[PDB]
Amino acid sequence: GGNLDSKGYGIATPKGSSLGTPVNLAVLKLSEQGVLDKLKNKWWYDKGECGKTSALSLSNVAGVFYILVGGLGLAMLVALIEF
Amino acid sequence: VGELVYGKADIAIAPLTITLVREEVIDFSKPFMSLGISIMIKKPQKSKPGVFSFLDPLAYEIWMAIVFAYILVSVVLFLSARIVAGVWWFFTLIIISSYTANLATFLTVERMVSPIESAEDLSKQTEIAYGTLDSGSTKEFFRRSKIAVFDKMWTYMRSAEPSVFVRTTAEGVARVRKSKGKYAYLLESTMNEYIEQRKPCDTMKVGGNLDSKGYGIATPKGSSLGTPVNLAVLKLSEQGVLDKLKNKWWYDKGECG
Amino acid sequence: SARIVAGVWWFFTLIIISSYTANLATFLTVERMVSPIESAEDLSKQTEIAYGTLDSGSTKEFFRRSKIAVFDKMWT
Amino acid sequence: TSALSLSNVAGVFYILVGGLGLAMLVALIEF
Amino acid sequence: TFLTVERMVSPIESAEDLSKQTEIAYGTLDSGSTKEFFRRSKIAVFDKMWT
Ligand SMILES: C=C(C)[C@H]1CN[C@H](C(=O)O)[C@H]1CC(=O)O
Ligand SMILES: C=C(C)[C@H]1CN[C@H](C(=O)O)[C@H]1CC(=O)O
Ligand SMILES: C=C(C)[C@H]1CN[C@H](C(=O)O)[C@H]1CC(=O)O
Structure with a gap:
């Protein structure tokens, strides 16, 4: 399913620090340059180990086998009502 | 932005995309809405079946020829017959196989x-x-982009003739609708979803977003309004007000929604 | 009379089984x-x-403080 | 994309006509 | 199929x-023109490959 709410992480700095505005501008720059994206793909997806089919199914024919056996059952029924 | 810098307005509330260039001149509140550059095209027509699609695989010539062949076999049988039935069987065998x-x-x-x-x-x-668009955050994104794909796309867009750029969103969408799917419109995910939810509903968004950014409320640098507005945006975000508002304007009243 | 019935039916079922196949x-x-x-x-x-x-953190607090029906029920 | 090739099948049509020709031949030598 | x-x-x-x-x-190779080509290359695909 989807996400319950939409929010985000962030770099935290003490109120009134000289580092705050530089840090923010840095994050913006990294965001627009795609640094954050490439980093995410690096750690999450790129090395991701989890990652059409020509193969046989016994299951698809099973239903028709059921209608076959049912048909033969009806056949036995008719054979009985006749005799 | 100009009205904010030169003090003609105390605050700016609008789908204003947050960019570094704008963040240098003004102050942005925490994003109240999330978006991204996305692709809009014309959705393909579901079906135009006719009865002609059944006569499509086999040529009309083959149908005429098989009819005349049929009547020829009939008039041959009218005048030994074993090889006739056999040859006819092989014939119709090859044909039904071919058709299949x-x-x-x-x-x-x-x-x-x-x-x-x-x-x-x-x-x-x-x-x-x-x-x-002729201007705005998306165009500037493609222009300043050093990323391979976006660089290529920008080169094409600027170099291509006639101009692929449009003045307004409605013009771009109209161009998507009129072009029979030969034109794609790059616009922020929000607008794309909104147009996608509006009749005639012939347009759709394909793939993910090219980038991830957000809108925000802008206030003049050193304004007293900045921190209260920000804390307010946070309050609304946590309270679910923003979500319900988007559902209100985008989805809930959606005709094709 | 019935010959053309058998013929047309055969053609019909032929086209259908071919299509299905x-x-x-x-x-x-x-x-x-x-x-x-x-x-x-x-x-x-x-x-x-x-x-x-989790025992604490933003998620738990979200469910606690949530005034939304579903999330409220879940929290209870 | 449909070749719907009349030419490939044309040969089988030819062997059909040939078979019916031989058939007419046999029908003639019979009577 | x-x-x-x-x-x-x-x-x-x-x-x-x-x-x-x-x-x-x-x-x-451990050395030679190919490896150095990949190292010094600034074009996207080959860069990724080098990484
Ligand atoms: C709709 C317009 C013209 C605005 C809205 N956001 C972008 C902005 O903040 O400039 C512009 C569109 C865009 O560039 O994708
Ligand atoms: C992993 C932990 C304990 C942290 C990380 N982010 C959330 C936070 O910032 O509160 C917490 C998880 C959570 O609340 O479910
Ligand atoms: C065969 C070797 C080791 C040499 C030949 N040319 C390259 C060179 O001129 O260094 C090297 C191969 C390579 O770098 O793939």
């Missing part, structure tokens, strides 16, 4: 073809022209 | 997987599958 | 595809 196969190829061709997935595919093909 | 190959296998829970709304409505969050 | 599997083409049709998949490992 060609029809199979039709059915492959139908579902197999994928028109567009991601922006990279747009960059790799010249068949479908594509463009953005 | 052709489409089945293309259809192949969907390999689709069933999902017990489609969305968060469904989760609130069933007691069969228990669910939880 | 099986005979279309035989008819299936392009396991790897380009250098880019190697960059796009982690299943098949790939490499160059």
Whole structure:
């Protein structure tokens, strides 16, 4: 399913620090340059180990086998009502 | 932005995209809405079946020829017959086999073809022209971009003739609708979803977003309004007000929604 | 009279079995997987599958402070 | 995309006509 | 379907595809012009490959 709410992480700095505005501008720059994206793909997806089919199914024919056996059952029924 | 810098307005509330260049001159509140540059095209027509699609795999010539062949076999039998029935059997065998196969190829061709997935595919093909607004955050994004795909796309867009750029959103969308799917419009995800939820509903968004950014409320640098507005945006975000508002304007009253 | 009936019917069933045969190959296998829970709304409505969050943090506080129906129920 | 080829099948049509020709031949030598 | 599997083409049709998949490992010589080409290269695909 989807996400319950939409929010985000962030770099935290003490109120009134000289580092705050530089840090923010840095994050913006990294965001627009795609640094954050490439980093995410690096750690999450790129090395991701989890990652059409020509193969046989016994299951698809099973239903028709059921209608076959049912048909033969009806056949036995008719054979009985006749005799 | 100009009104904010030169003090003609105390605050700016609008789908204003947060960019570094704008963050240098003004102050942005925490984003109240999330978006991204996305691709809008014309959705393909579902079906136009006719009865002609059944006569498609086998040629009209083959139908006429098999009819005359049929009547020829009948008039031959009218005048030994074992090789006739045999040859006819082989004939209709080859034909029904051929029909079955060609029809199979039709059915492959139908579902197999994928028109567009991601922006990279747009960059790799010249068949479908594509463009953005005459101005705004998206165009500037493509322009300043050093990223391979976006660089290529920008080069094409600027160099392409006639101009692929449009003045307004409605113009771009109208261009998407009129072009029979030969034109793609690059616009922020929000607007795309909104237009996608509005009649005639002939347009759709394909693939993910090219980038991830957000809108925000802007206030003059050193304004007293900045921190209260920000804490307010946070309050609304946590309270779910923003979510309910988007559902209100975008989805809930959606005609095709 | 019945000969052309047999003929037309044979042609009909011929075209149909041919079409079915052709489409089945293309259809192949969907390999689709069933999902017990489609969305968060469904989760609130069933007691069969228990669910939880961390002992503390933003998620727990979200559920605690939530005035939204579904999330409220889930929290309770 | 449909070749719907009349040419490939044309040959089988030819062997059909040939078979019916031989058939007419046999029908003639019979009577 | 099986005979279309035989008819299936392009396991790897380009250098880019190697960059796009982690299943098949790939490499160059311990030294020489190729490795240095990949090291010094600033163009996207080959860069990724070098990384
Ligand atoms: C709709 C317009 C013209 C605005 C809205 N956001 C972008 C902005 O903040 O400039 C512009 C669109 C864009 O560039 O994708
Ligand atoms: C992993 C932990 C304990 C942290 C990380 N982010 C959330 C936070 O910032 O509160 C917490 C998880 C959570 O609340 O479910
Ligand atoms: C065969 C070797 C080691 C030499 C030949 N040319 C390259 C060179 O001129 O260094 C080297 C191969 C390579 O770098 O792939």
